[PDB]
């Protein structure tokens, strides 16, 4: 039913935020390199 | 620049495409993606409370709470926009999407933030809302960006989400629309961006007609071609027209 | 929009 789907949403969200932190840190480094 | 058109949970094609983009973009690529995908001990991110105006709050504190909520969702650096925004859709449809943003609680970019800021300020008539769009040029390419202009108690400000801290929220301290727009332009020049076009929308109705969309381009200035005296002249005229409901 | 920014 809609149960296994909610479990997938939560796992996808955990991975999205893990990924977004890593990508945000990348963009921060590149921005620091350009501004120097 | 991918958009999730598959809803939630995100379907395989959209999900695998996201991972391949970031694998290409990130210098540790495959090692980074492998560290996250199917990792057994990922923190479950907390879900931030949706802000809601109460009479005990000052309007600036309320607006700051809206902006902090957006910052807590985070700017979306994944390369996959998670909520599809059709800019010309009626507001009634866009507000369903905004609610979906508060329910699914994922990172957002600039256009989603404008829609979300409209949703979270709907119903406070003291706040007038209108989109402000920018087309900029930087090292040979054009960039588009949009924020939510705010007018309240004779002052202008903005809400939004950007990769840069100076291209999003602005406090309710600008005495004219020109001052607000010129502050964005000065902020852009810190990043070596030249502003090519400025587009000002209409006020977004708090209670829109069933089919009314956002109007994004009631005033369009090709600011790169104009002297600043003329830019200010045209913005001030338009802002006066806005404030009079012409 | 895409680039935002």
Q: Strand, helix or coil at A36?
A: coil
Bond from prior residue into B9 cis (ω within 30 degrees of 0) = yes
Bridge partners of B225, per DSSP, are: none
Is residue B158 part of the annotated active site? The answer reads: no
CB B202 within 8 A of CB B242: yes
Solved by what technique? X-ray
B104 vs A9: CB contact, 8 Å cut-off? Answer: yes
Query: How many angstroms separate the CA of residue B164 from the nearest CA in chain C?
Result: 7
Task: List the catalytic residue out of B2, B152, B162, B187.
Answer: B162
Chain C touched by B105 (CB under 8 Å):
no
Chain B contacts in chain A segment 1-36 (CB below 8 A)? 5, 8-20, 22-24, 26-27, 31
Inter-chain residue contact B105 with A9, CB threshold 8 Å: no
B145 included as an active-site residue = yes
Alpha-carbon distance of B107 to B5, in angstroms, equals 16
- Do B and C touch, 3+ Cβ pairs within 8 Å? The answer is yes
For residues A14 and A20, what is the distance between their CA atoms, to the nearest angstrom?
Answer: 10
Count of domains for chain B: 1
Q: Which 3-state string (H, E, C) describes chain B?
A: CEECCCCCCCCHHHHHHHHHHHHHHCCCHHHHHHHHCCCCCCCCCCCCCCCCCCCCCCHHHHHHHHHHHHHHHCECCCCEECCCCCCCCEHHHHHHHHHHHHHHCCCECHHHHHHHHHHHHCCCCCCEEEEEEEEEEECCEEEEEEEEEEEECCEEEEECCCCCCCCCCEEEEECCHHHHHHHHHHHHHHCCCEEEEEEECCCCCCCCCCCCECCCCCEEECHHHCCHHHHHHHHHHHHHHHHHCC
Buried b (16+ CB within 10 A) or exposed e, B31-66: ebbeebeeeeeeeebeeeebbebeeeeebeebbbbb
Cα separation, B76 vs B59, whole angstroms: 27
Q: Report the residue count for chain C.
A: 5
Residue B221: phi and psi, rounded to 5, are: -110, 130
Contacting subunits of A (3+ beta carbon pairs below 8 A) = B
CA distance B4 to B13: 10
Residue B90: give the domain boundaries: 1-246
Could you tell me how far CA B21 lies from the centroid of its own chain?
Answer: 23
Return the H-helix or E-strand segment holding A13.
helix A2-34
Q: What is the resolution of this structure in A?
A: 2.1
Q: Please list every residue in chain B whose beta carbon sits closer than 8 Å to the beta carbon of residue C3.
A: 1, 143-145
Smallest Cα–Cα separation from B129: which of B113, B109, B106, B107?
Answer: B113
Residue contact A23–B15, C-beta within 8 A: no
Among A26, A32, A35, A30, which Cα is nearest to B23's?
A: A26
């Amino acid at each position: 039913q809609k149960s296994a789907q909610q479990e997938l949403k939560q796992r996808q969200r955990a991975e999205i935020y893990a990924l977004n932190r890593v990508m945000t840190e990348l963009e921060q480094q590149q921005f620091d390199e350009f501004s120097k | 620049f991918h958009v999730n058109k598959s809803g939630f949970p995100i379907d395989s094609h959209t999900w695998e495409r996201m991972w391949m983009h970031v694998a290409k973009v990130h210098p540790k690529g495959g090692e980074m993606v492998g560290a996250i995908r199917n990792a057994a001990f990922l923190a479950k991110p907390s879900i931030p409370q949706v802000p809601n105006y109460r009479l005990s709050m000052t309007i600036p504190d309320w607006l700051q709470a809206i902006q902090n909520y957006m910052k807590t969702l985070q700017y979306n650096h994944t390369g996959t926009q998670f909520f599809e925004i059709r800019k010309m859709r009626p507001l009634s449809g866009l507000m369903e999407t905004a609610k979906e943003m508060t329910r699914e609680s994922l990172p957002i970019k600039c256009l989603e933030a404008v829609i979300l800021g409209i949703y979270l300020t709907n119903g406070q008539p003291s706040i007038e809302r209108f989109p402000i769009s920018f087309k900029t040029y930087f090292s040979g390419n054009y960039f588009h960006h949009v924020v939510l202009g705010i007018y309240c108690n004779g002052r202008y400000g903005s809400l939004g989400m950007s990769r840069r801290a100076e291209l999003m929220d602005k406090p309710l301290t600008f005495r004219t629309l020109s001052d607000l727009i010129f502050d964005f332009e000065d902020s852009y020049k810190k990043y070596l961006h030249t502003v090519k076009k400025v587009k000002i929308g209409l006020y977004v109705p708090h209670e829109p007609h069933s089919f009314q969309p956002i109007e994004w381009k009631q005033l369009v200035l090709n600011v790169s071609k104009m002297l600043r005296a003329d830019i200010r002249k045209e913005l001030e005229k338009y802002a006066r027209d806005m404030r009079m409901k012409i | 929009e895409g680039e935002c920014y």
